[model samples]
Target: RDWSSPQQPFTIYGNTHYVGTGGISAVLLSSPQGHILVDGTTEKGAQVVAANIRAMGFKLSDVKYILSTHSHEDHAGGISAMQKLTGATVLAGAANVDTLRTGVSPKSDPQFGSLSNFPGSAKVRAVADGELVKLGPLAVKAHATPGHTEGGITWTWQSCEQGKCKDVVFADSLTAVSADSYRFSDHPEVVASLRGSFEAVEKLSCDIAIAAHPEVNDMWTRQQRAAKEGNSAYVDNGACRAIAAAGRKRLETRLASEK
Candidate 1:
């Protein structure tokens, strides 16, 4: 769970869940400007996440956006607390915007064990496709990829290393976290939707893909290595496609079982 802040500003650290907590989280630490801390977990877990941010030289304020991958308790439980701490805009898919809309309040949220009420959580900033958040010298772009949850989205940014540019990413289907009991998980209808999400990501052509899960996002580190060797686009996409295949296969199995 302990991490050393690297002097390199553009590195993406994917072990977001305290390294051993099994609590999934992902982060994109951009250039000298700031970072996009996506997916906050439990109370103690999130505080540790925050400390990691501060430890990395980015003050809590330096966090430009606190993105909730979805409204799931494990991924988003700390939003109220993190926003309380970072004073950052909470960005999430506009499709899920209504979930946090003033009217829905309690009923709009799912029965996730953590909190019984969604309470419109924090003051969330609705993010749509192609929207960009500028943080100092870095910029984050939002791409909609909903399936597991209607408003699930993945945030991306491009950073240069030694003059080489590559994509940094974070996202995945939150509804899949509770897969065992999620009879509706990875459904064909859902997979079809997820397929669309992948197409959107391909259209973005971002070299990195950050999922809510650290293990998923960390794939880019390996991709980053390949890109630096001169086959970035091929390597990154290959990694993405491979991971996407794994995710889809799981979904296919889940859906088949459901059927």
Candidate 2:
């Protein structure tokens, strides 16, 4: 039952910080007016995440929005607890809204075998593709990247530190695995979604690309690299496209295996 969350919170560069668990990713985006948090970890990890935020010298009350890249227990499990604690407006894509509004796992989900429902249900404001949601000085744009979960969203925003600004991408899951009874190629819509996701992520200009799960992008290795090189080392113009292309390759492999 031990999730590999960090012992304490730390800087991820610019105004953004990592406040989730060691295993999952919950990012804190700060602005002078308010704050935004992406991903919510788990129910058990909620208080720990809150404490992590405070440890970083941020007030939970300052949070204005709680956004999730997708709705799954590991990511959205803490949403209800967090929403109650911070009173932040929850924003997500239409599919996630439907999934989280009832905390019910979609039948089509690849993880449906184990995950049934999220801890609690709450209302959500649905965001569309290429839609922008502004919070104070922070403006996050939503990109439809639906393969991982039907309503998955990729968020992009500009963050600044010491007068240097950079583009950040909160990329969603790109792994192409389905439930025991499901197959990606069997669902034409799902296949198309994955295809579009690869294209959408390639179009993103990412300097700092973070995943719903940090491990998805060698976060530990990158962190070590950042320590040795500098914070700016995390900036890679090709990071987004690289992961997208790699994910597409994985999907291709999965489809090929089905034959």
How well is each residue in 172-209 modelled by candidate 1, as lDDT tens digits? Answer: 55333333444454345655676676666545555655
What's the true lDDT of residue 137 in model 1?
72
Residue 65, model 1: lDDT of 72
Q: Which segments of model 2 are wrong by more than 4 Å? A: 1-6
The residue-by-residue lDDT of candidate 2 on 206-244, one tens digit each, is 989988778777676777787787677667788898889
Q: What is the TM-score of each candidate against the true structure?
A: 0.73, 0.94
For candidate 1, the TM-score is: 0.73
Report the alpha-carbon TM-score of model 2 versus the true structure.
0.94
Worst 10 residues of 1 by lDDT: 1-10
> How accurate locally, in lDDT, is each candidate?
0.57, 0.83
Against the hidden true structure, what lDDT does model 2 obtain? 0.83
Off by over 4 Å in 1: 1-10, 13-22, 31-34, 98-120, 174-182, 185-191, 202-204, 217-235
